[PDB]
């Protein structure tokens, strides 16, 4: 081991990641709706796994940063769904649902990624740096409380965010 080389490798890999994220940020300058984000990111998966990914929610416009964060989150979640969850078998299904909530006056954005009818989700299922990082980036861009549950019945991700015009333009 050499700590100086380990730090250098981490920076170089981080810079490579930032470069890839800027390519996405430039492309997505106008933002997008959850529907457009969701359908666009999950299009390669809808080809391979027809009628196994379901999306439902109101028409809702989101900023450039959230469109990028959410795209990679959706892509990364589907990548794992094929390797471990609902898309690893033949009967497993993914339900992406979002909506505009109300806490007796305060308007909130809620989103759920729900995997069902997939294989059993075995007890020591613990996230690595990448997914942890993506979830953290997504939650920070949304200024959201994010809950990740590795339920035996299937992975359940919940996002609860306050509505601000920075994150949700024209709101
Ligand atoms: N949709 C899903 N359904 C069931 N288990 C899942 C899952 N997504 C992830 N897991 C579990 O979480 C573990 C950790 O996954 P993660 O992708 O976070 O890190 P990793 O670094 O262990 C593998 P990799 O980075 O190659 O995907 C996986 O090994 C798997 O057991």
UniProtKB/Swiss-Prot annotation:
FMN binds covalently to cysteine after exposure to blue light and this bond is spontaneously broken in the dark. Induction: Induced after invasion of host macrophages. It comes from the Bacteria. Photosensitive kinase that is involved in increased bacterial virulence upon exposure to light. Once ejected from an infected animal host, sunlight acts as an environmental signal that increases the virulence of the bacterium, preparing it for infection of the next host. This photoreceptor protein is directly related to the bacterium's survival and replication within host macrophages, as it is required for optimal replication of bacteria inside macrophages. This is Blue-light-activated histidine kinase. The lineage of its organism: Bacteria, Pseudomonadati, Pseudomonadota, Alphaproteobacteria, Hyphomicrobiales.
């Amino acid at each position: 081991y050499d700590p100086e080389q380990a730090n250098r490798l981490f920076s170089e890999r981080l810079r490579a990641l930032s470069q890839a994220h800027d390519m996405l940020l430039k492309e997505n300058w106008a933002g997008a709706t959850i529907q457009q984000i969701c359908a666009t990111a999950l299009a390669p998966f809808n080809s391979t796994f027809a009628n196994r990914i379901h999306m439902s929610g109101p028409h809702l416009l989101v900023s450039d940063r959230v469109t990028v964060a959410l795209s990679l989150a959706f892509y990364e979640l589907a990548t794992n769904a094929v390797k471990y969850g609902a898309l690893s078998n033949e009967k497993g299904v993914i339900n992406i649902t979002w909506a505009i909530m109300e806490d007796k006056g305060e308007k909130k954005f809620h989103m759920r990624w729900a995997e069902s009818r997939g294989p059993e989700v075995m007890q020591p299922a613990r996230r690595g740096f990448g997914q942890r990082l993506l979830h953290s980036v997504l939650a920070e861009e949304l200024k959201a409380k994010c809950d990740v549950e590795f339920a035996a019945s299937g992975l359940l991700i919940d996002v609860l965010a306050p509505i601000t015009p920075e994150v949700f333009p024209g709101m």
